[PDB]
Amino acid sequence: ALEEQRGPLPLNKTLFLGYAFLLTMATTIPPFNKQYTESQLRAGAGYILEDFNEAQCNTAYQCLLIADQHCRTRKYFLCLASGIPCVSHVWVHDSCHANQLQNYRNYLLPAGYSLEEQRILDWQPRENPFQNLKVLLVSDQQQNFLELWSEILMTGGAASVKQHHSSAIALGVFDVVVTDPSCPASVLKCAEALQLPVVSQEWVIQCLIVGERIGFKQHPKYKHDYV
């Protein structure tokens, strides 16, 4: 049942012509075979993205994310911010079985587990979730925070994102501070005095799952110091 349900290769050499694919694997329905799916897409003249790139997605190609389910990875967050549809790998399989492109809207993967809704949420077109938002990122980790949330927020329509390490801005011009327990007490006190909300990354992630700016103090996990 497995090898057959994985599907064959597309006879139409140009089945996926004009589509770019960004596959992501949830950390460990038929199981996701990343390289086999890549072979199926490449055989139908599908273009495989090395990583997220809005220079081809916003231009010639119709980008789509391929995954086995909803996951909390960088590619998933970038597509949730850019509004790129999250589509199950079965869509590839079921299409190669038919040698005809299937409606990916029937293969939409969920966004994730919502804290406000207390359940897994189905995906809807986002159309920017951080419009007109000035964010200050404060952290000790530069790569998986100062760069990660910078790119994710910027591709989400943020008006401005500033990157500040936990040792060295305009402040008051910002709308929210996204940090972690490595936030210095100076930033916390200055933000408190200015009535500037300070949240954790879970507020951003939940904003991506729900698809809209949710309340800063809506859930206890939104606090940066949540230990």
Partner: protein
């Protein structure tokens, strides 16, 4: 265009009744929602205050309940379609068992699947007309409904096709119909 889902008892006062038959098909009147199992017998009763004339036909057609997917055609997931009743196409979601005069229409315009059966009056001493429906795809089936809630639309029409009555109800095809019914039912009275 999405077919209408407005209740229309019509001149005959058409209404729907639900029974049960481990529960294989259950109905919540608070949610107006049917929870059944894959390819299980779903009794749907027809109650009329005025007996419709012969030639009357009962059509069934499923639509998506959410607005963003309402325009999307309901079909069977290609997995369950690749693997059979006989008269029922493998892409159709809803089937009817127990009736030998059943028809399946695909509609050359809308391209939506529907299944029709000639109306029959209540038999020996009965008070309604029970039709046995079958749902050939789980709600969570990837490639088909794909977790999207669907409404079943039951319509009465004459021999030509003009509308005479209409009623609808939500359907969830799941493994545990009872557990899910209680779950959503509480998940509803808890809002107050």
């Amino acid at each position: 265009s999405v077919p209408s889902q407005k209740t229309y008892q019509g001149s005959y006062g058409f209404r729907l009744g639900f029974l049960h038959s481990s529960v294989t098909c259950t109905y919540s009147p608070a949610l107006n929602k049917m929870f059944c199992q894959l390819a299980k017998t779903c009794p749907v009763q027809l109650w009329v205050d005025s007996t419709p004339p012969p030639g009357t036909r009962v059509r069934a057609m499923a639509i998506y309940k959410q607005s963003q997917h309402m325009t999307e055609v309901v079909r069977r997931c290609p997995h369950h379609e690749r693997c059979s009743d006989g008269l029922a196409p493998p892409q159709h979601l809803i089937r009817v068992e127990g009736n030998l005069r059943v028809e399946y229409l695909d509609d050359r315009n809308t391209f939506r699947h529907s299944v029709v059966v000639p109306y029959e009056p209540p038999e020996v001493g009965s008070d309604c007309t029970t039709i046995h429906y079958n749902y050939m795809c789980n709600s969570s089936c990837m490639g088909g409904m794909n977790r999207r809630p669907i409404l079943t639309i039951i319509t009465l029409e004459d021999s030509s096709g003009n509308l005479l009555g209409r009623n609808s109800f939500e359907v969830r095809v799941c493994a545990c119909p009872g557990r899910d019914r209680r779950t959503e039912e509480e998940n509803l009275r808890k809002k107050g």
